[PDB]
Design a protein around this ligand. Structure first.
Ligand SMILES: [Zn+2]
Ligand SMILES: [Zn+2]
Ligand SMILES: [Zn+2]
Ligand SMILES: [Zn+2]
Lengths: 196, 117, 198, 194, 197, 117
């Protein structure tokens, strides 16, 4: 199982998230207290990349979802066999990949051949004019309660950086609870942190 | 120079009102009919301080200039300044640990808070 | 399908009637039946004893076919099938293909049928006469999906058709009863008894 | 062209409609001032049947959409050739019929052989226990701006009653503007009346 | 389709380049072209003059084939065809089958092709040399559907492939340019210039 | 009987305020620098009464207790009570035909208003 510990590197790689509201039917939201992104199926998850230095050209950004619980680490975070057969493809993703990326022509998808898991790769672009971050619009294709896939188990999404050879430059991790109600499921897990 | 204001609207604005929020005495008692005097056997049952204290909501405190935020904690402290001085004793509620310096909802899970000097 | 089989109750000259156990309405019952809606509520992979009450004894070689059809008319073209998750789970009793909703335990001679015109699922046991002391032969049925399974029944209420036929296949009698399979059978009877008093 | 005049009969046949809100994206709504139902494509249009007496068994309810404008009465209210080839069938309707009915197993569909038009028939059921009306969940399969079909022309949907022989027992008519925004298109046509 | 033809720009040894009129960005223009996106915006059944700028004169018998393909990769399997409403309208110029999106006016020698492997629509005119005073030969193109037609293009942006071939059919040069056909060509250039900044 | 109220809050409520809505004198004049005195040649150009009158919006007048509705027409009439008495003369605007008895938006198109006695 690949590691989930936060790797800053010499590059100052940090994940930025939009400060979105906690409405009942939000499309994507992030909790700073639990480092937990709550979002929907097949919807836009803009994840900002805040860097202290500009990386050399050819650098790429790999996303990978792993289970947070240790008793389920042997299972690959995969789609349920119902959603594996639905016609929800964007024309670039195999139907078993949980993570997807829209708004980019150069996305890679990987079934890694040792660890048997799903990896989602985009090439990193520098921040635009006026910008301090490059936003990757992520898409998750299953909820966490899908039977045969995640199955009510909370998952951690690992965002990694690498150059074209594949050596690791930086890694940040954040928890993911995908359900139909993202903003409300942040609220019952903020009720989880305040005792009594 | 000039425009030496003979002070009208400094700190003596909170002191003077007396009819601005504390008059908010309705459901009147017009010609009362339902009445039965009885023996005093049933106990008091004062309500609590759990509900007089207000559990903190998450999406609030955006508009809310912090002259109102620090005064809101001073509402659940000056209503609390009776019940640990004179009267029936309640416990300390759960929300009182944030009545702190930064914020109520500070991150403690998920460490590596950006190594720096 | 194109030729959806009929759901109208067929008594015949045999007096074929479905008997159901008068079981309680607890929150986590294994199988229950409503007389007011003719609706059996039961779980996944659990015993559903359906009694067969007959007025005359059928000749030897007679069989009992079960078939689940949708109750709603806008979904009649879809075969009542298992969801693609439960179609790939290892829940087989060694006799059923993994797409069949209905199963039968406690019988060695069960048939399973994918019919080749109407493309649907049929579950067949041979009929046995009632035993000593008995007036009915109980078939322990097993449903393998809940009605809210995505890709299968998908929150659509279904009718299970119990049919009788001799070894040639001509229809001798048919009774129909609604089926709402979820995780809470006895409670889902109660909110549908709250549905009728209104 | 079949007649659009309201026929009560000796049966007291009257169309009932749900008093639904005027939200921007409603599924079905009805205007009492214009007698105009606004609804979506392939969505539930519950039309209540209020009767003064109970009809004999074997009675049926035929729906038919006709154009309201007189210069377009010669054209059959039909689906556009795009939606005539889409896979939106409920398994009971031919792909040229505008009107459909869900929640009923006994629906008929008719291409009438003199007047060349589309008719949608369900058998009438009496009102249930507690009920004073039998609701038919109607489904329209094209919007009124479909090119080659209705093509921005307002249509009248004719609800008729007949016994099994086919003689007419009662007829009520109500206008239909099918678009993507039913509740908003009621509002600009209430702005039309004032 | 089964194998989708290529959209990469082919210059060749002939110096084949597409020329477009520098037309204004009015609200109701008949045809306009964006240089920043290489995107032609035009109307239904209207004149789209596309100039052919060549570095050398081709031999006689050379032809110009036009083909519209989808720009998006998830829709490449669908043939760019007319909607079933406009496939049954009486808008024919007497030379085109009613499923072809592209047409050509002002030329008697136009060919129309339903290709028999890739199942798509191709529009062919024979190339003429530039006239006296001219450096280009203008082909007046006509598109017969907007991009939002239901059953045809259906809000999907398309690329029109202009190809050159001699009478045998071997490819001599190919240029590609995007096409957004709607009712407002000059305004739809402006919201896609607002897209780039 | 009793509770003969020595009247506090009858009709002398509108008369007494003087600082409740008419004080709404901002964008102050602190240490003015931009100034150039010149000849008085350019004309006045008073603005109009077309924009001082407010065109009637349709969705309004729901919450709007008609003590405010009839007073709103009394705003465009008492601002009009100057301009047809003393000052520059304007015309009568288009909205003044509803400053009527039933409503502004009364039906006149589509007759057959329900035959009755
Ligand atoms: Zn799933
Ligand atoms: Zn299932
Ligand atoms: Zn249509
Ligand atoms: Zn079209």
């Amino acid at each position: 199982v690949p590691s989930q510990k936060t790797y800053q590197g010499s590059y100052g790689f940090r994940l930025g998230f939009l400060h979105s509201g906690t409405a009942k039917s939000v499309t994507c939201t992030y909790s700073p207290a639990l480092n937990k992104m709550f979002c929907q199926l097949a919807k836009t998850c803009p994840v900002q990349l805040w860097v202290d230095s500009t990386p050399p050209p050819g650098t790429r950004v790999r996303a990978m979802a792993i289970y947070k619980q240790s008793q389920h680490m042997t299972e690959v975070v995969r789609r349920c066999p119902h959603h594996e057969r639905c016609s929800d493809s964007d024309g670039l993703a195999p139907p078993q990949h949980l993570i997807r990326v829209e708004g980019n022509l150069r996305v890679e998808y990987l079934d890694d051949r040792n660890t048997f898991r799903h990896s989602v790769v985009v090439p990193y672009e520098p921040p635009e004019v006026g910008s301090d971050c490059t936003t990757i619009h992520y898409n998750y294709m299953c909820n966490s309660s899908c039977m045969g896939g995640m199955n009510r188990r909370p998952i951690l999404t690992i965002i990694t950086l690498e150059d074209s050879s594949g050596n690791l430059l930086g890694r940040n991790s954040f928890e993911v609870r995908v359900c139909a109600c993202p903003g409300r499921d942040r609220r019952t897990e903020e009720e989880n942190l305040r005792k009594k | 120079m000039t425009s030496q204001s003979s002070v009208i609207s400094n700190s003596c604005v909170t002191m003077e009102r007396l009819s601005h929020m504390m008059e908010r005495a309705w459901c009147s008692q017009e010609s009362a009919l339902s009445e039965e005097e009885e023996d005093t056997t049933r106990p008091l049952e004062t309500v609590t301080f759990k509900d007089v204290a207000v559990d903190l909501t998450q999406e609030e405190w955006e508009q809310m200039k912090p002259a109102q935020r620090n005064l809101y904690r001073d509402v659940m402290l000056e209503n609390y300044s009776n019940l640990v001085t004179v009267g029936c004793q309640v416990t300390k509620p759960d929300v009182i640990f944030k009545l702190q310096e930064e914020e109520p909802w500070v991150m403690e899970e998920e460490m590596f808070g950006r190594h720096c000097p």
